[PDB]
Amino acid sequence: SGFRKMAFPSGKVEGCMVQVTCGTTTLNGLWLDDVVYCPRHVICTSEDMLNPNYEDLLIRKSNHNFLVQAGNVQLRVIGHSMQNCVLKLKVDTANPKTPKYKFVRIQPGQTFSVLACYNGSPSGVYQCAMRPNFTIKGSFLNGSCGSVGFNIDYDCVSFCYMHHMELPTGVHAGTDLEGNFYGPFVDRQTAQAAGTDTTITVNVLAWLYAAVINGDRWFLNRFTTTLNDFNLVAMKYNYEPLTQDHVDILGPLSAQTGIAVLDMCASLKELLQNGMNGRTILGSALLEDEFTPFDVVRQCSGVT
Amino acid sequence: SGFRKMAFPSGKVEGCMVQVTCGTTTLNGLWLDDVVYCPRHVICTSEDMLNPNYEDLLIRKSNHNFLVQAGNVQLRVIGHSMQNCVLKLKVDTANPKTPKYKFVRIQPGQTFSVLACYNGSPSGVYQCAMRPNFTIKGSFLNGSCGSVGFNIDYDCVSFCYMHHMELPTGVHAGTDLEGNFYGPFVDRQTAQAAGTDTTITVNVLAWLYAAVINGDRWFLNRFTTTLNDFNLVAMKYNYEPLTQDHVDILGPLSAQTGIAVLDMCASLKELLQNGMNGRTILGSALLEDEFTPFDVVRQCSGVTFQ
């Protein structure tokens, strides 16, 4: 019993984190086999950031401009290139702690664990969702760039995020490990802003199933609705549309609790129209939307 | 910017988790050097749990009635003993991944990271506070016993919790690593229940300081309070008394923000009176009490957003 926001165990990722220095800038890199991946903005001066020509700025760099440290050991850089917004530094030593891994790009609504790092040293772990506006609500200070997000599946680490920057509202933007940004953001000092965000409807439903699994049932009611009518309500309340695919993905939780998704949708419709009447759900006075259906199943089932 | 419940990186503890089997029961153990620590209830049948005599149950066991598995490898048990409510199994192999560590018994209000495990395999990591009523609000299923809680300030793992059982309200009870329960609980099936809990006042204050550090002041007011008047009000909302020790501990956060501790106490009094008027603080619509002053200093910028 209980229901908590839970991160994946971070040990397999900890053993991949290194410090990357270029000139006066230090941030974090990810060392997998004999390549270190880090944000390409590491190469830029302050002035360069106003309008960087990364093709040219990288041409002006050589292996010698990069220092990589794994603990107390200097790794010699023997090659460099870029893939999109990620810099790749080939080093003379393969990481002996490299896990089985994949680079996976995630979709809005999906969650992942972040291992926040400073100076190549892991500092803390938390759970994040990719928001519909392609930002994440992380917790990052200066020096955190190159920290990564990931999921684990059996023995395989799926890396899905590398941290690049903080937007004016204090939310965070970054790339997949192939260096493609999430959202319409660029690694340039220019005016940029988080778009208006919305609530992840399928995740709120998943969390209402979690609440039922954990014995909190007060919001259940005799009514059902249609997918069409529910989506009219969602749109009014700045919730994402619920698709038939979402209904299918909620199938396991629906089967475990015995509550049809469109039955639960009538609960959520009433909560949006009426509020919580001073009550809480799973200890919360807000509807929580950073648990996926899989997150709920994983935690209510005890997968390792 | 941002503020999240943040656990310690779990790798140093993952390398210590093993599976312990006794008869038909499997749960987790903590392997440090050549000792595996686990809950002594592993030796009990379900019927034994009404009125166990652990001395009499344990004398009937041999080393070879315990199986310990580290990944794919069986470790041979070569000794056992009981210390309070923990069983210590001596094994034939020292753990080569043993971190620098210590054992610490914590006070109510203190936080730690929990590595929830099943069958000796880590499942997930999350933060918990030791509640005033000596329970924790975890997420544990059957098979989670022997999961541990810890902090890793400055490269040394301080183990402070081992999971033993769930109470009727769904909150969790366990021991320090010397096997002494937190609170009045026992490893026996009794009518024991969590006492009415209270809110950890010093932690709520710490979190309001975090909110100011991160740029928000809406909840401040023009008032101050005495410490005694603060406690007289706060206890009416089932908040813990604030002591002068707590005031001292909040001093660095007070210094960074320029808000006197008793001025932040006046803010909290007003929040308890008024609610949030549809606003949030650090993304929460309720007051959060599972961040310590130390936790805030650990996570937040040393530079306030003025």
Ligand SMILES: *[C@H](N)c1ncn(Cc2nc3cc(Cl)ccc3n2Cc2ccccc2)n1
């Ligand atoms: C990453 N660790 C980090 N720490 C601070 N920031 C913001 C920032 N500061 C600089 C300084 C220089 Cl000399 C180059 C780049 C840079 N950045 C990153 C950045 C990214 C996108 C837009 C603007 C700045 N990052």
Ligand SMILES: *[C@H](N)c1ncn(Cc2nc3cc(Cl)ccc3n2Cc2ccccc2)n1
């Ligand atoms: C720990 N992994 C765990 N999982 C389930 N529980 C509760 C429980 N179930 C049993 C079954 C048997 Cl055969 C013996 C003991 C036992 N316990 C532990 C318990 C029972 C009553 C009071 C305190 C602990 N624990």
Ligand SMILES: [Cl-]
């Ligand atoms: Cl109806």
Ligand code: NA
């Ligand atoms: Na219904």
